[PDB]
Amino acid sequence: VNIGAVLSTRKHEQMFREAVNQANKRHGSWKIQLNATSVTHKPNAIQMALSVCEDLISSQVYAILVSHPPTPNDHFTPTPVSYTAGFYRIPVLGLTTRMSIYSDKSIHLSFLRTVPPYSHQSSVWFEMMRVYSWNHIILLVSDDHEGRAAQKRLETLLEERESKAEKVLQFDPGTKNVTALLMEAKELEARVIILSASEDDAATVYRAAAMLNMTGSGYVWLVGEREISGNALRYAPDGILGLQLINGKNESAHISDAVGVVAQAVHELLEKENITDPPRGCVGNTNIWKTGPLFKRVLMSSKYADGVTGRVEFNEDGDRKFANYSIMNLQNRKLVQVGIYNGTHVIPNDRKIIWPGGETEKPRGYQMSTRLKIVTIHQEPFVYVKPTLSDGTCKEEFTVNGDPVKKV
Amino acid sequence: LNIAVMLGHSHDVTERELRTLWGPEQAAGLPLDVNVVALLMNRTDPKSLITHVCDLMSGARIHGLVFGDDTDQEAVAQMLDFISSHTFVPILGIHGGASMIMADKDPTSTFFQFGASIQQQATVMLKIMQDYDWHVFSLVTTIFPGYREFIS
Amino acid sequence: SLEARVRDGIGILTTAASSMLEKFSYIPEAKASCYGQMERPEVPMHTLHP
């Protein structure tokens, strides 16, 4: 066992070595005890992939850790390592990658992460929906994989309640003018918006909706986690309800948890029937591992709660489950926490929120319109049709006793 | 132009000049002039694949390499797509490896396949069923990647 | 058979190239090499994908 990893900066390598040494000193598997291997995120894309082999497959590792560097690329870290290690069916363990393309275990084959990806915040949206008695939404969404996945997840969750959302309007990513859809979304009877898109699109939609008087009284917004980030916090309307992950952009706790889980799993695989060795060398061998799928199966089914992250329990497609979200709200452009989400249930705090506008109530999400549009058809004595008079009014006709006849 | 061709060395592992003998006179006029750089391949490794494609690019101003494999690893296609997402050259596979369609490719990549997706297979299935008066059934599925899309 | 597949692929590529030429012929060349230092995305237009 020569477990390696691909971290971001040199400082984390000493911490990784200390964590692996603590794991070896505490409890693990005998084998060759334990070791570590490091490599930095080179910003050359293709080159990085090659380097992986030349530093990790060349040493016959058993699992690869990948972490997100602070460079704003959103895919720079995980894709090359995931593909290269998926060729040989060796499993990897992503640290901080919340993108939802990886919870699609037919392209990445073997990929486990320790942070829930976005759509579970749509599950949290539904849970928060239940506790406040809201029943009508006009949720917006993007058009990439992220938005479609979130919308599909929310629809699947809502189907169990024998109900449905009102409108599912969507826009192309990175637009410049949106006011058409927002104008279309005004003349409805729902007052809950579940906008979920990227940061720049969020800023654009906020600026467009500020001119339509949609931020006033009785318009409960709901914005998940990415559209209250750096740029989107400039034009936000005071009264939104943004979520977050308590242990989010952190690496020490996640590194410790990943090392613990991997060591505990390795201390379980060696005590089995058939044991094989890693396919050392990138070139040459071109066959899958004889224990790869079994390694992933045993790693995925592993309950262990002894580290500072919370309870760890991988679900179905090895994504994540049972995480904690810390709801916040925006008052006078100052984020304030007003609750905690503990898993399948919400817990309000002893703090008063302020809805957009500034009233302290629970704005009803419904309206009544009372402007029904009626459609008829010219037929029989049921609905006559006669050409109008250019003066402006139809005519003035009578009946057997001269009673006036109503005309519209 | 120029368009390299690589083969899996399984079916037509002979007469590379015959593949190089495409369009002896012409096909329908041939407004452009192209030449193949047909290169026989071997066991496909990710580092080997990347090095081969990049070095072979650094030569004769290469274009939509028509890849074709002989084995069944289910991963090479993904790897292939990866290259086509960082080097703006079209890539379309023919046989075996680069023939099992992936669900959703990257939206800035030029990579095309020759197989049929799951939806077309389901359509052909339901066209068979409708043609023999079997309008009653009950599908069963396991936990295998992509069952949700098929059921939906 | 495989020969027909190779013929079809080569034909589809040359037809796409001919369409681009007949449209706005400025046919580009290879993107230097993929082994370089940095890549700056400045594609003048959609090359031949559409």
Looking at chain B, which residue has its C-alpha nearest residue A173?
B107
Answer whether A136's CB lies under 8 Å from A366's CB: yes
Distance CA A285, CA A292 (A): 15
Q: Do C38 and A44 touch (CB under 8 A)?
A: yes
Please, which residues bridge with residue A331 across strands?
A: A334
Cβ-based contacts of C13 with chain B (< 8 Å): 1, 3, 34, 63-64, 66, 90
- The tokens describing C7, both together, are 């013929």
Question: What is the CB neighbour count within 10 angstroms for residue A231?
Answer: 12
* Amino acid occupying residue B17: E
CB hemisphere CA count around A339 (13 angstroms): 18
Question: What is the CB neighbour count within 10 angstroms for residue B57?
Answer: 22
Chain B neighbours (≥3 Cβ pairs under 8 A) are A, C
Edge-to-edge strands, sheet with A112-113: A4-6, A64-66, A92-94, A112-113
Answer whether A246's CB lies under 8 Å from A300's CB: no
- The tokens describing B141, both together, are 């599925």
B149–chain A Cβ distance below 8 A for any pair: no
Of B12, B62, B86, which is closest to C3 when you measure between CB atoms? Answer: B12
Distances (CA, A) of A11 to A19, A69, A114, B117: 13, 13, 21, 46
Annotated binding-site residue numbers of B for Zn(2+): 11, 95
Q: Give the experimental resolution in Å.
A: 3.8
Which residue of A84, A100, A148, A151 is the best one to mutate when testing the B interface, meaning the one whose CB has the most B CBs within 10 A?
A: A84
C39–chain A Cβ distance below 8 A for any pair: yes
C24–chain B Cβ distance below 8 A for any pair: no
Of A45, A105, A109, which is closest to B75 when you measure between CB atoms? Answer: A109
Scan for tokens 């099992």, then name that residue.
Answer: B100
Scan for tokens 């043609």, then name that residue.
Answer: B131
Q: Do B46 and A109 touch (CB under 8 A)?
A: no
How distant is the Cα of A317 from the closest Cα of chain B, in angstroms?
9
Distance CA A291, CA A82 (A): 18
Distance CA B68, CA B82 (A): 16
Distance CA A59, CA A65 (A): 15
Looking at chain C, which residue has its C-alpha nearest residue A49?
C35
What's the distance, Cα to Cα, between the start and end of chain B in Å?
Answer: 44
C19–chain B Cβ distance below 8 A for any pair: no
User: Which among A60, A116, A112 has a CA at the least distance from the CA of A91?
Assistant: A112
CB hemisphere CA count around A297 (13 angstroms): 6
Answer whether B28's CB lies under 8 Å from B62's CB: no
Q: Do C39 and A45 touch (CB under 8 A)?
A: yes
B47–chain A Cβ distance below 8 A for any pair: yes
For strand A346-348 and strand A339-341, is the pairing parallel, antiparallel, or unpaired? Answer: antiparallel
Q: Do A46 and C38 touch (CB under 8 A)?
A: no
User: Which among A405, A402, A390, A357 has a CA at the least distance from the CA of A239?
Assistant: A357
Q: Do C6 and B94 touch (CB under 8 A)?
A: yes
- The DSSP H or E segment spanning A193 is strand A192-193
- The tokens describing B47, both together, are 């580092």
Q: Do A49 and B75 touch (CB under 8 A)?
A: no
What's the helix, strand, coil split of chain C in %, to 5?
Answer: 45, 0, 55
